[PDB]
Write a protein that binds this ligand. Sequence first.
Ligand SMILES: *Cc1c(COP(=O)(O)O)cnc(C)c1O
Ligand SMILES: *Cc1c(COP(=O)(O)O)cnc(C)c1O
Ligand SMILES: NCC1(CC(=O)O)CCCCC1
Ligand SMILES: NCC1(CC(=O)O)CCCCC1
Ligand SMILES: [Mg+2]
Lengths: 358, 359
Amino acid sequence: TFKAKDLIVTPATILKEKPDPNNLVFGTVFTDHMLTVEWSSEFGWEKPHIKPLQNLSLHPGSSALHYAVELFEGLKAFRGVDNKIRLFQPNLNMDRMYRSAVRATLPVFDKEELLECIQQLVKLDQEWVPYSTSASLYIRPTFIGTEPSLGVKKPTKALLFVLLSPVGPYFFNPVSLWANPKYVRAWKGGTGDCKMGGNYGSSLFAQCEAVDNGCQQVLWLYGEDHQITEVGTMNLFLYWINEDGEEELATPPLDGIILPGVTRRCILDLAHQWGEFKVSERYLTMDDLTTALEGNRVREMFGSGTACVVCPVSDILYKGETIHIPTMENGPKLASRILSKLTDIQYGREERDWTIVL
Amino acid sequence: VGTFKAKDLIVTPATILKEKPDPNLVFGTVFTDHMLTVEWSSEFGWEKPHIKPLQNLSLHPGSSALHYAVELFEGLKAFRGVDNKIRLFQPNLNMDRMYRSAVRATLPVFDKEELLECIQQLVKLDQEWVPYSTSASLYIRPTFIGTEPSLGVKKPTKALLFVLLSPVGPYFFNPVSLWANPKYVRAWKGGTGDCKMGGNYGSSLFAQCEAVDNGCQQVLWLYGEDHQITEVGTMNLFLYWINEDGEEELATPPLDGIILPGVTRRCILDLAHQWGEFKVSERYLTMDDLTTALEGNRVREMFGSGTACVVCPVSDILYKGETIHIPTMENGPKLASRILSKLTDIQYGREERDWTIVL
Ligand SMILES: *Cc1c(COP(=O)(O)O)cnc(C)c1O
Ligand SMILES: *Cc1c(COP(=O)(O)O)cnc(C)c1O
Ligand SMILES: NCC1(CC(=O)O)CCCCC1
Ligand SMILES: NCC1(CC(=O)O)CCCCC1
Ligand SMILES: [Mg+2]
């Protein structure tokens, strides 16, 4: 494994102008520096670099281009209202990226060395961490196989790098979802519980089909009973009165077709902590939903993820009809409370072991 | 909404040419002198195609092919006939599959004829690499990748199409042993298993490793509660046997969405249908159908088909801690061998047929 202590820094000689915080398109503007660490089965890991944001030089046969031997992560840096820059649950991302690496047969690395390197990269480009309480700096760790051979096997050459991109919003701005059981995002025995590239390229066709049909995201359905799994590539939360008549906040269980979002776990933690309603990790089907709506039992439906934190849902185009979800006419009370809590913690307006300082 | 044209090819010869390897090669290990590349932007469409010296790709770190596997590929070969004339085999099908793939990936469409000609031109240039052997060929790897310099999961506004050339011999007869663990699923109804998109492959290296660890060379992909057998590693699966009706039969899974329509598969089905010596059935095959058959002496052969092996005999399957031997080798294998001879006779010009295009 590589070590932060060996970092080699090559500052850009011409720094870019920081963008306008009020209107940023997600992941389109990049900072001045990036992190890069090369690996080869022959000599192991080389020393990590922090150099000007540049194009990668890859052999046209790199397995990442042919067999999707790749995985990524998503985490943010926030400038606290006390002007101190913080990271949110960073070690959980390191753990997920590590487990995905193993399932991808990519080379392992010392989680703490990566986190420290990332902190240094952020520290160097710190002025990119927006001066806004509604904006942040997206951190994108990426791991690709660069095996020059076309043979399908464990890579003997790989690259690990990190990009920094100042972001505002990913897309309250409620969204409509397009539900069509003809497409499946992930399946049992699959790799859907990992952030491996191969899980997203296969979804673009359905995404496109949603856009030209009036929606902004796909509602992923699975199985014979049409379980509702995720809002686009965000975890799904349903706030309602369940079949037993008790107020409840529900989300699909981690049975292998659901990605264990950090946001997801935090909302469950805050929900369990408030103890004001039942919190269940259970299955939810379209019929559980439509049945519930015609009984006026649904209050809010939203998605969770690092980019949005939470993103309310107001409609679902299903069997040829549009099903309205009373999310926005109900506040959304909980959606807001949640977003309010999480950001309060991210920007240090509240102390809690979920953030890391500079 | 357009295409690039072979008539616009800008050729740039390498000044320093590499020495060809020994025709007797590690699959996809050695590459030729030149490559083909074609840039695409949603703003101006397809650029003009180039044939330049092999070289790295200069990609933006945010390229969508590295983050969301916005990619797809193909695999075909050129053969030097026993008449020294170089031949391509069923190219038009590869172009059709790549096309259908691009669309399923939301990558930009192109004129299949133009691409094919552009490929003939690339090979034509590097024809001396086409092995002077009868058991070796040149692997043609067309590749289509998204170069969207943005982290947003969306239809790419930038793409890159290229083609690599790699002289090769074999992939690994030489029977293989299969690892059958139902905990790993290659494809699912509603997914992209029936296209050659990179996302279907990265996710299997773990199972492959688990395979070797257990003395096996490939993974037998199982699907559904009834453990249907779908593909042998990344090759289509054929089972020559006496079915439940006592009839001689050549069976192979149907294209119901989780099997990739291989060119070698197509051919083997056409040959089988043509000879009309036994029943040819595209149907569901399960481990239980296989076990029941084996413990009844009803199995003749099992083998995978693909461009790299053409045909690959299966002799064993590790299932539920038990090793199940397949008598494929103790039966010639007559069918497997017959197929190999036939396809090879045709590819190397020994047999004349429409399945090839000379250059
Ligand atoms: C990244 C991701 C999420 C959200 O996880 P967070 O760690 O909370 O960002 C949800 N679903 C999918 C499919 C994802 O890729
Ligand atoms: C490419 C491929 C095949 C074989 O197709 P051929 O065109 O015969 O080489 C079989 N199965 C999978 C999963 C493939 O990707
Ligand atoms: N829905 C978005 C992300 C997750 C998130 O932050 O919600 C995953 C795909 C790559 C961009 C990020
Ligand atoms: N089994 C192999 C291939 C197909 C083939 O030619 O059999 C697909 C994966 C990438 C290498 C080629
Ligand atoms: Mg250590």
